[PDB]
From a paper:
The AcrA-AcrB-TolC complex is a secondary active antiport system in Escherichia coli, powered by the electrochemical proton gradient across the inner membrane of this Gram-negative bacterium. Its biological function is to capture cytotoxic compounds from either the periplasmic space or the inner membrane, and to expel them across the outer membrane, into the extracellular medium.
To further assess the proposed proton-relay mechanism and its influence on the conformation of the TM domain, we solved the atomic structures of four AcrB variants, namely K940A, R971A, D407N and D408N, all of which abolish the drug-efflux activity of AcrB. In all cases, the crystal structures represent an asymmetric configuration of the AcrB trimer. Electrostatic calculations for the R971A and D407N crystal structures indicate that, like K940A and D408N, these variants lack the ability to bind and release two protons. In R971A, like in K940A, a first proton is already bound to the protomer in the L and T states (alternating between D407 and D408, respectively) and a second proton binds in the O state. In D407N, like in D408N, only one proton is loaded (on D408), and only in the O state. The structure of R971A shows that K940 is engaged only with D408 in the L state (while D407 is protonated). In the T state, K940 switches towards D407 (while D408 is protonated), adopting a configuration that is arguably an intermediate between the native T and O states: first, in that K940 retracts away from the repeat interface, unhindered by the now absent repulsion with R971, while still paired with D407; and second, in that as a result D407 loses its hydrogen bond to T978 across the R1-R2 interface. The structural superimpositions shown are optimal overlays of TM4-TM6, and thus highlight the differences in the orientation of TM10-TM12 relative to TM4-TM6. The conformation of the O state, however, is largely unaffected by these mutations.
Residue numbers in the entry:
A (entry chain A): 722 to 817
B (entry chain E): 15 to 166
C (entry chain A): 242 to 337
D (entry chain B): 818 to 865
E (entry chain C): 194 to 289
F (entry chain B): 674 to 769
G (entry chain A): 578 to 673
H (entry chain A): 50 to 193
Write the structure that this text describes.
């Protein structure tokens, strides 16, 4: 059955205005809350993966979204809350 | 009360009647702060909306991100739920944590009669959201020419 | 090793001080994912769920698996043991 | 590497008068006194 | 030209604003034990209509003015290519 | 068929002992074998022995301090000393 | 379990299923291999599976100790469990 | 990784499916796309189809779709298998001295046992109940 | 090009090797990785195996591991060939 | 590079005590050196063959021979954690503070691999604790970058 999902809208205008790139925004959002397979390393002779992700305690609550910052072109740190908005909606966790 | 939440979502008209007859909490909420009224507005259950309201449900209940059942109705084009909510005292100018009003949401999804109804109930056309946008700004950006003049 | 990842150099500050990866992250070995957790009679376990290739003989493949397992066992770390929680195969041999 | 693990291939033969069968058995015998974690396997002609 | 833009800018904006982003989860594994909420994060989804493509934001002028895709291009559904046109007894047709 | 004389033996790293440790076991086994001239003869590695190699370490901090990118460093070294396949041209009608 | 259910709750339910076979089917059940996060339809925080191995047929005399009565008894017990779909089932003669 | 079901379906599943054509003896095709980030597409064939050729035909079509898939999906590896859908057997691994945890055991299994069991003839698919280790960099947004 | 034995083994050989799964009738697999910048992995199949089916099964598993290989190796390409065949003749061409 | 010299370079590397013994009796060049300037003493120090180190030193090996990048047997023994070999070398006059071409010392190397006992032995024999490599780093600097708290306190 459908379940609650967290819909977040990136405001393109504010992003351009502040000088924050959409690729930085999406990589920050996704690497943190979703995890990112960066590259490989060698563990006891075996090639294995390297993953980057938020530590559990910084990706459990909706308010945590604004604790993450992206760096603008001009060097400023901008919190996610400055260029985005969010709402609850329903969606499917398994599409057949 | 969990049963009332689920029943309201499913549209089960008489399960909602029974459960309130048996004393469930009209303003029970789930993990994201939605009430049975939130759920009925979202999926479009006019009858359940009306029953819940007649049994003293908060018409201005907000979820964990500040959105009300009117926001959901107006966003998803459920006209017959929007007037009803409004007739029971829904904050026509309610803002969520983003500064977004039901008028914003109706305007964005192009629900013209809904906007007209929201307007007659006194919606602030000048209301900006966290990005300083009014419903008019939206109508212009979305190229909805019809909606743009209705906001003049 | 974690030590080596910990000392990855993110940047060097104005006063020349060092910002190391271990200054912005906890660094550990951990699963590629954390979704699947298995118990054997309430005790911590892992396992291999094996599916038979299209048209292959079940009894023969079970044998080949056993033979491959036997080659591994002498090099097990202490306490490590194979258990046999679910095998559809003995029913074939015994019923016949 | 052999079958996905680090490996070192060793060639040799039976002394004059001895069967390769015999010579293989001594190798297995010697191989069995090796440090913890070292294993072995027969390949190629030996496998055959 | 009137807006000092090229197809490069158009293509870049489309890739940025007609995007489908993997954004991760709230309360995903490994969680902080005690977590009650598990929800997908939904960020950008693919555009679905000419109206959405039309309001893609190419740039904002220094005088606050907006330059949108529809101000430099016509937007419509149309063939992946236009080389093949068929007729059935003189009347417009398609076929397999 | 390729040489069907003698035997063909594989010494295997079954834990994570590593190359140096595997060499030591190989040598151990080779020593024992040579003590049975009566049974074993010409028992030898098929592969190659370790050799001197020039290990060069890039100092990340000094590279960052001089403003030299690691990618420029590693491309410069690899392309120069290793050679680099850049792309293809066409020589008298054949791609090369 | 419903989508939205946490890993912890799926473990709570798996604990009850394990408990049942360990305590109410002592004569019949030899082992239980329970997996959190894996189900017939695929991965998820809200899904799981128990592989049950039984004692040998000779130690399970009578219809009451066979897979049909066992799984029926077990499905009936598990029907009390709150907010979960839990059932034991014999795999069909052929499957497919 | 990190993808919701609709992202998976619209960015991966639909693309592979649209490329599934000209496959002999195909009776039907089904698929799931879920909010784990995961896709499974099952192509079922007439009885007596050669499963080697079926696998070959399916993968030839898939290779056309691959360059069209997101870089991260490609790097997770997509696989094509020819096997029964039920489990033949489950090989369990425990530690009877309790000197290795659930995670330890799972990594030992992934790193030392799984590949050789996967290469064994007749073994169509292997599921690890657990996970191989990876270098885990757990970020802190405050310090960043 | 330019790679040492270990670089080859740990970014190419191991990755390919970890993907040689679900191939029929394999007897064993062997490989060397050397400081000429070369890997050869040789898979030997049961006598009576169809050599074409074995090759395509190997090629297809490789094709799906290609995105995990270094860019420069993907650029050089990875060749899969029947190995157990021998020469009819060698034609030398000299200049005098 | 002489014949018996070559044989000595290999025997030392391979840790064949007996062969080395015989070669010493026959006068195999203890100062033989390969292309990268490693002497049998470099080889034994590298691969950890204690007895052969002792025997080579009895027979006039240059304890302070350096390779073409300026590295000594003490460098190698300290880097690869060969404690008893490090002590033998130091007793036989090895320059405790020898810098290679990069300005790296046995102490830098021991500290970098976390060899605590070796660090202590090198300090005992007078290693310069403030010695800087070509990047101006000390063994202490190396300790704290590595996050080695034990070693860090030793170097105070
Ligand atoms: C000669 C023909 C072979 C008969 O082999 C027959 O095999 C079965 C199954 O292996 C044996 O033994 C069986 O006994 C009991 C009887 O229920 C089974 O539950 C058990 O699994 C099995 O060991 C029989 O004792 C033997 O008679």
């Amino acid at each position: 059955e459908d379940t609650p999902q967290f819909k977040i809208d990136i405001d393109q205008e504010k992003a351009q205005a502040l000088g924050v790139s959409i690729n930085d925004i999406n990589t920050t959002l996704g690497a943190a809350w979703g995890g990112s397979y960066v590259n490989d390393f060698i563990d006891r002779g075996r090639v294995k993966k390297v993953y980057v992700m938020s530590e559990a305690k910084y990706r459990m609550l909706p308010d945590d979204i604004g604790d993450w910052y992206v760096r603008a072109a001009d060097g400023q740190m901008v919190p996610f809350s400055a260029f985005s908005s969010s709402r609850w909606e329903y969606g499917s966790p398994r599409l057949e | 009360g969990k049963k009332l939440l689920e029943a309201a979502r499913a549209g089960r008209d008489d399960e909602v009647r029974i459960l309130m007859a048996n004393g469930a909490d009209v303003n029970a909420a789930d993990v994201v702060g939605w009430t049975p009224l939130h759920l009925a507005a979202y999926w479009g259950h006019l009858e359940i909306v009306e029953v819940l309201l007649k049994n003293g449900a908060d018409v201005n209940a907000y979820d964990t991100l500040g959105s009300t059942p009117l926001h959901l109705a107006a966003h998803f084009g459920h006209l017959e739920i929007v007037e009803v909510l409004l007739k029971n005292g829904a904050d026509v100018n309610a803002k969520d944590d983003n500064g977004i009003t039901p008028l914003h949401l109706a305007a964005n999804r192009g629900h013209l009669e809904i906007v007209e109804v929201l307007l007659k109930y006194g919606a602030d056309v000048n209301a900006q959201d966290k990005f300083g946008k009014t419903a008019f700004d939206i109508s212009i950006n979305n190229g909805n020419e019809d909606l743009a003049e209705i906001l003049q | 090793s974690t030590e080596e990842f910990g000392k990855i150099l993110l940047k060097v500050n104005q006063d020349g001080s060092r910002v190391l990866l271990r200054d912005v992250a906890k660094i550990e070995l951990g699963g590629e994912n954390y979704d699947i957790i298995a118990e054997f009679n309430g005790q911590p376990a892992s396992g291999l769920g094996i599916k038979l290739a299209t048209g292959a003989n079940a009894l023969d493949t079970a044998a080949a698996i056993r033979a491959e397992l036997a080659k591994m066992e002498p090099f097990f770390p202490s306490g490590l043991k194979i258990v046999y929680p679910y095998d559809t195969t003995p029913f074939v041999k015994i019923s016949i | 590497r052999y079958n996905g693990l680090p490996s070192m291939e060793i060639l040799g033969q039976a002394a004059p008068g001895k069967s390769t069968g015999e010579a293989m058995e001594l190798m297995e015998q010697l191989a069995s006194k090796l440090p913890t974690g070292v294993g072995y396997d027969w390949t190629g002609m030996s496998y055959q | 030209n009137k807006f000092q833009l090229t197809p490069v800018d158009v293509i870049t904006a489309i890739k940025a604003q007609n995007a489908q982003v993997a954004a991760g989860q709230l309360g995903g594994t490994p969680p902080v034990k005690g977590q009650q909420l598990n929800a997908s994060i939904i960020a950008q989804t693919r555009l679905t209509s000419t109206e959405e493509f039309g309001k893609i934001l190419l740039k904002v002028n220094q005088d606050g003015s907006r330059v949108l895709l529809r101000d430099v291009a016509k937007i419509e559904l149309g063939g992946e290519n236009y080389d093949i046109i068929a007729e059935f007894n003189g009347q417009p047709a398609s076929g397999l | 068929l390729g040489t069907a004389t003698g035997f063909d033996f594989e010494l295997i790293d079954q834990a994570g002992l590593g190359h140096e440790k595997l060499t030591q076991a190989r040598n151990q086994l080779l020593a024992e074998a040579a003590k049975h001239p009566d049974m074993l003869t010409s028992v030898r590695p098929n592969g190659l022995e370790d050799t001197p190699q020039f290990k060069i370490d890039i100092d990340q901090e000094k590279a960052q301090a001089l403003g030299v990118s690691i990618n420029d460093i590693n491309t410069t070294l690899g392309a120069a000393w290793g050679g680099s396949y850049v792309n293809d041209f066409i020589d008298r009608g054949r791609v090369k | 379990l419903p989508a939205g259910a946490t890993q912890e709750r799926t473990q709570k339910v798996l604990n009850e299923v394990t408990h049942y076979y360990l305590t109410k089917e002592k004569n019949n059940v030899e082992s239980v291999f329970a997996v959190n996060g894996f189900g017939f339809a695929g991965r998820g925080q809200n899904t799981g599976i128990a592989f049950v191995s039984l004692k040998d047929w000779a130690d399970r005399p009578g219809e009451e100790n066979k897979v049909e009565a066992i799984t029926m008894r077990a499905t009936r017990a598990f029907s009390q469990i709150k907010d979960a779909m839990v059932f034991a089932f014999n795999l069909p003669a052929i499957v497919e | 990784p990190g993808a919701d079901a609709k992202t998976v379906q619209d960015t991966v599943t639909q693309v592979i499916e649209q490329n599934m054509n000209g496959i002999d003896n195909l009776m039907y095709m089904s698929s799931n796309s879920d909010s784990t980030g995961t896709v499974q597409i099952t192509l079922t064939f007439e009885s007596g189809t050669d499963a080697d050729i079926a696998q070959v035909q399916v993968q030839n079509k898939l290779q056309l779709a691959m360059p069209l898939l997101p870089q991260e999906v490609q790097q997770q590896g997509v696989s094509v298998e020819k096997s029964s859908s039920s489990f033949l057997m489950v090989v369990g691994v425990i530690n009877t001295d309790g000197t290795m945890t659930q995670e330890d055991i799972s990594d030992y299994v992934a790193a030392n046992m799984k590949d050789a069991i996967s290469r064994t003839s007749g073994v169509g698919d292997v599921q690890l109940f657990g996970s191989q280790y990876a270098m885990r960099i757990w970020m802190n947004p405050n310090e960043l």
